[PDB]
């Protein structure tokens, strides 16, 4: 019967192509019904001044809303017709938009995509109704206390980069921002080879390249006005903010230090050490002994709604961190009880702790994968950020590898003695104080 | 006794026994300078503190 | 390969075993309890069932189960709907020998001590006031107990004058009565066969015939208003219609597909379904309508559900009644209902891309048929259905009795009868 | 271990019975034991009737020792009717913590 | 197709020991909040959000 | 009242190896920690003699 190692080499390869002006084509083919197909660029809030913020979150807030041959009532009654779906999200660093349909119906797909990204029209009438929706969504999610604390600890963390502004903007900035700004944008972004075209499923590669050439190559290949940023390698700074309001029932915290890039070769290892803290929540079947040493204390004490841990990366920096949801009385304990543990880990780390970590990561790799719309996204970024798409035995040789030193050394350059970032949000007046927080960052006695 | 057998309380001391060495160092030489130790204290000629 | 391999037994229990080349691998129980099978003087035995998975067993106790799961990676859990339950484990494919002992053991034999039983009874307060922070596990309560009298007619959770009295005497009952062989099906996804065979061939020494199923749901009009202090109504006027397993089903999923039932693209103006734009012919302000249809295995509801403001509530309902009259009047065309039919292929499809959606597709229907049957099949029979009979299924919703359930500030609503 | 003594260790344990004095003042062997973490668990494991029973035998037979005297010779406790009701939940609150420090060592 | 989620509607509670506990169905699907003012009630002892159960990394 | 939010400048307090806001921090990390625990390292041992 199939074992795991001659079951992780069976799966099939990944083909690539490219065009004259540069798109680079792939696709994965395994002989279903159905299919998905999607663009993905590489644009986002990140390359973006002071002067216009919000500016990206119109493109894709009215693409979908009438070409220059098909107006928008048109274009999504065709689609409804077939029985398909459309989707599109945008972040700090990307964008994306993608279609699902039906194996048959690739020609008419792939010439409706085309015809969305290639050439669009910006209707005043349409900009006026605009505008309010999103003037509405703004107050809409000023309501998430979720969202508000991921955005202040973006806030006082990177403070004067590009990378410290938010995706939708300032309010008094969405209010101004007219046709001419919005037509450069996508003159001066919205270009190859900056751009994927990823499908998977029942794809054939041949005819996806066809296709491509077909609607795709009367395309500017040559860089206009030659706008080539450079990289800024960015700054990482110790601060905190703090709000009170008073009247809410919960306090949310936040903290986090540095930590590496996409490519850096120390990803692995710290992903196996955050798997050793792990999560919780009040509805859990089998709490108050369950293995984490932080897991167990709160269930049986009860001082957590809450609590997880993030490993947020971009080109070149990154964040290492845990958020917590919890009462008015019992904050300092959960500091106290949080910071401990790092501290046990940089120290002796045992030869138990690390093979249940292993098998963690090992299995939630092949789980996120299972499926059609996950696949070409990630096939999408897998290449929008180095290339090669590193098939599942190469992750799995670098699982083999991790040991209890390991652990030791990494956990002991990134976490000891260094000054963190802290976000609370009220009420929080026993949050200690950032002395008092910053000296639970190395031990005494070692 | 059972409750303390294992090989998780012999790492631990062999972690620790920097932690009692250092502990045990640091208590016998201040045992040293706090009594006025004269019979340690020539051991190094380098502390010339009586007179 | 051998895309399913059916089994009978002596006793019931279909086996049904996928061989598959995937890393990972999946099994699943599937049984035919629900808070249906309950009568007046045990409601919340069920709710109680599904929350106590984890706990001590005559082959391990509740240390050594939450250890050895955690210790590989794998998972557990369980569903449940008004008709059936399912346990699922999941993990990797060198590991499967090990998950499965403790599923087969969770379900075959427990022992209920008194001092756990009388600590899990403070859960259920918590889980039931998450489950009601969205306005409609609310509204679907009240519907059920304002159109039935006596079967389907119980909720799903725990009524709030009975939390501390559940005894760990009605555990037992419910679990002997009705966990019986004859009535479960065990399905693996990436496993082989006789494997399955053996491991389940222990599971029979358990009961032999089933328990008792009883209560046929007869029907009756209610209507349940609820005030509160929301700024959105929530309503919805239903029928009875068809049971599923029958030929008139499939025309009363096409009238739903007709009529409006969701959308397709993103942030978007829905211009192909008709009571939408029926609607907004003079409502200008937010708000939201589709269909609304349930077929279980006796019985079915079909109708309209509509969200809307406080003191515009009755011109968007009785707005969405007069275009479903006009269906029933001969006004339909052929071309619509060919863009109807394509809905539905595409979503079924789509609904079995998964390797979880192709386990509750199996195990849903290996119980109330008892064999399988592709794709291919379900696409010709649902397009074997012609113009008439979409025409005449909406004149039995017109013709027929009716169920109504609001909440919010009903200030300006109408009565049943109105 | 023997089997023809085992009329003797019979005869020596009817000796050591009445030797040790709580049958005067009414008490039963469980009655007597000292209250550790371990013990203290095994207490609120118990059925209502066996615990409330447990609260008079303790009350009755303290405050005899503070007048000085003892109970009538009738309502002695016998040494063929008494009964170890603390025994069976005490051996199970011990051998589920032999299982949570042999999985910390291995 | 004989189920009673391959026809959208009514729902069904899930729950695990691992993971957070879910609300059957949603609706078909979310129009309800692209019109504006869906304030999404809150202050609660509120449910957090994203649904942190399942990672890659 | 809640997108909006700017940490106003903190640019004449900052050390003049990180006050350029270009470049990161995590070379300039070792000279203050070696700098600012150097005032207690003399005050150890002049608690000490």
Same mark, same amino acid.
């Given at each position: ?33 159905? &299919? ?109 206390? %979720? ?31 007219? %046709? ?53 390698? &960015? ?68 001082? &957590? ?102 652990? %030791? ?9 260094? &000054? ?27 | ?51 | ?6 089994? *009978? ?16 691998? *999946? ?8 808070? *249906? ?44 709907? *008004? ?336 | ?106 | ?57 | ?49």
């Amino acid at each position: 019967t199939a074992t795991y190692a001659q079951a992780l080499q069976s799966v099939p390869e990944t083909q690539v192509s490219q065009l004259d002006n540069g798109l680079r084509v792939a696709s994965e083919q395994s002989s279903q019904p159905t &299919c998905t197909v999607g663009v993905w660029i590489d644009a986002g809030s990140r390359y973006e001044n002071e002067k216009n913020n919000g500016a990206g979150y119109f493109v894709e807030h009215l693409a979908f809303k009438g070409t220059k041959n098909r107006p928008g009532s048109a274009l999504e009654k065709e689609v409804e017709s077939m029985g398909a779906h459309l989707n599109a999200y945008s972040t700090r660093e990307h964008t994306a938009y993608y279609i699902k349909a039906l194996s048959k119906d690739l020609p008419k797909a792939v010439e409706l995509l085309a015809d969305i990204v290639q050439n669009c029209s910006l209707e005043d009438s349409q900009i006026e109704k605009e505008r309010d929706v999103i003037l509405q969504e703004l107050q809409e999610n000023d309501s998430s206390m %979720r969202d508000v604390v991921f955005d202040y600890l973006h806030a006082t963390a990177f403070q004067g980069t590009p990378l410290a502004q938010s995706v939708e903007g300032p309010s008094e900035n969405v209010r101004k921002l007219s %046709r001419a700004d919005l037509t450069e944008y996508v003159s001066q972004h919205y270009k190859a080879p900056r751009m994927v075209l990823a499908a998977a499923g029942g794809v054939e590669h041949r005819q996806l390249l066809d296709l491509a050439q077909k609607h795709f190559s009367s395309l500017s290949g040559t860089y206009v006005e030659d706008a080539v940023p450079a990289f800024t390698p &960015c700054r990482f700074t110790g601060s905190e903010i703090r709000h009170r309001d008073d009247a809410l029932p919960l306090a949310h915290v936040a903290i986090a230090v540095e930590g590496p890039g996409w490519a850096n070769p120390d990803n692995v290892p710290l992903q196996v050490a955050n798997a050793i803290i792990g999560h919780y929540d009040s509805t859990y079947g089998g709490g108050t002994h369950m293995s984490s040493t932080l897991a167990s204390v709160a269930a049986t004490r009860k001082l &957590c709604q809450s609590f997880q841990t993030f490993n947020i990366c971009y080109a070149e920096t990154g964040l290492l961190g845990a958020h917590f949801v919890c009462d008015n009385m019992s904050i300092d304990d959960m500091m106290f009880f949080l910071q401990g543990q790092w501290m046990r880990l940089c120290t002796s780390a045992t030869e138990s702790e690390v093979v249940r970590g292993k098998n963690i990561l090992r299995n939630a790799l092949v789980s996120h994968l299972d499926g059609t719309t996950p696949v070409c996204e990630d096939i999408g970024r897998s290449l929008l950020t180095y290339g090669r798409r590193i098939p599942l035995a190469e992750w799995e040789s670098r699982i083999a590898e991790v040991d209890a030193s390991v652990v %030791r050394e990494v956990c002991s350059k990134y976490f000891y003695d260094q &000054c963190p970032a802290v976000a609370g949000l009220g009420p929080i007046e026993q949050l200690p104080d950032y002395n008092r927080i910053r000296s639970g960052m190395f031990w005494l006695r070692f | 006794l059972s409750r303390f057998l294992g090989p998780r309380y012999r790492e631990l001391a062999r972690n620790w026994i920097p932690t009692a060495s250092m502990w045990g160092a640091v208590g016998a030489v201040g045992l040293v300078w706090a009594t006025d130790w004269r019979l340690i204290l020539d051991w190094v000629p380098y502390i010339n503190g009586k007179f | 390969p051998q895309d399913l391999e059916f089994t *009978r037994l002596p006793n019931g229990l279909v086996i049904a075993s996928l061989e598959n080349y995937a890393p990972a691998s *999946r099994i699943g129980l599937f049984i035919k309890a629900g808070s *249906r099978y309950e009568d007046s003087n045990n409601l919340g035995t069920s709710h109680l069932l599904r929350l106590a998975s984890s706990l001590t067993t005559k082959g391990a106790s509740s240390f050594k189960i939450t250890r050895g799961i955690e210790a590989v990676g794998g998972k557990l859990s369980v569903t449940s709907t *008004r008709e059936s339950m399912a346990y699922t484990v999941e993990c990797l494919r060198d590991d499967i020998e090990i998950l499965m002992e403790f599923l087969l053991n969770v379900t075959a034999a427990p022992e209920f001590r008194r001092w756990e039983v009388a600590a899990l009874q403070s859960q259920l307060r918590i889980d039931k006031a998450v489950a009601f922070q969205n306005p409609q596990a609310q509204v679907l309560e009240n519907l059920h107990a304002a159109a039935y009298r006596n079967a389907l007619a119980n909720s799903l959770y725990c009524p709030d004058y009975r939390i501390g009295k559940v005894t760990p005497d009605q555990l037992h009952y419910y679990v002997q009565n009705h966990f019986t062989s004859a009535r479960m099906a065990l399905i693996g996804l990436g496993v082989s066969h006789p494997v399955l065979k053996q491991v389940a061939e222990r599971f029979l020494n358990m009961r032999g015939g089933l328990g008792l199923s009883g209560a046929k749901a007869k029907y009756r009009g209610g209507e349940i208003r609820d005030q509160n202090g929301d700024s959105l109504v929530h309503a919805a006027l239903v029928a009875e219609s068809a049971a599923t397993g029958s030929a008139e089903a499939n025309a009363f999923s096409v009238l739903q597909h007709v009529l409006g039932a969701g959308p397709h693209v993103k942030r978007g103006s829905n211009a192909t379904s008709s009571l939408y734009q029926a609607v907004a012919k003079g409502v200008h302000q937010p708000f939201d309508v589709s269909a609304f249809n349930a077929s279980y295995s006796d019985s079915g509801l079909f109708g309209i559900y509509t969200i809307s403001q406080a003191a515009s509530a009755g011109d968007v309902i009785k707005s969405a009644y007069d275009q479903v009259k006009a269906i029933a009047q001969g006004n339909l065309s052929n071309t619509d209902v060919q863009a109807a039919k394509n809905k539905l292929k595409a979503g079924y499809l789509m609904s079995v891309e998964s390797s979880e959606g192709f386990l509750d597709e199996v195990g849903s229907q290996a119980l109330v048929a008892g064999s399988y049957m592709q794709p291919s099949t379900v696409l010709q029979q649902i397009d074997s259905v012609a113009d008439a009979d979409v025409i005449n299924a909406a004149k039995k919703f017109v013709s027929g009795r009716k169920s109504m359930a609001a909440s919010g500030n009903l200030g300006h609503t109408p009565f049943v009868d109105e | 271990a023997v089997a023809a003594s085992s009329k003797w260790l019979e005869g020596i344990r009817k000796w050591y019975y009445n030797a040790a004095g709580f049958n005067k003042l009414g008490l039963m062997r469980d009655d007597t034991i000292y209250e550790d973490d371990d013990v203290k668990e095994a207490i609120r494991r118990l059925p209502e009737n066996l615990y409330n029973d447990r609260v008079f035998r303790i009350k009755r037979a303290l405050d005899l020792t503070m007048r000085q005297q003892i109970l009538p010779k009738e309502q002695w406790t016998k040494y063929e009717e008494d009964k170890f009701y603390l025994e069976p939940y005490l051996k199970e609150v011990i051998r589920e913590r032999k299982e949570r420090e042999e999985w910390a060592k291995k | 197709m004989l189920s009673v989620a391959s026809r959208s509607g009514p729902f069904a509670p899930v729950l695990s020991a691992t993971s957070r506990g879910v609300a059957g169905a949603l609706r078909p699907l979310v129009q309800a909040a692209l019109p504006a003012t869906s304030e999404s009630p809150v202050l609660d002892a509120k449910r957090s959000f994203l649904c942190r159960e399942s990672l890659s990394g | 009242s809640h997108t909006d939010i700017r940490v106003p400048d903190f640019s004449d307090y900052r050390r003049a190896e990180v006050l350029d806001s270009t470049k990161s921090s995590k070379e300039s990390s070792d000279a203050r920690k070696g700098f600012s625990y150097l005032i207690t390292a003399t005050t150890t041992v002049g608690v000490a003699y």
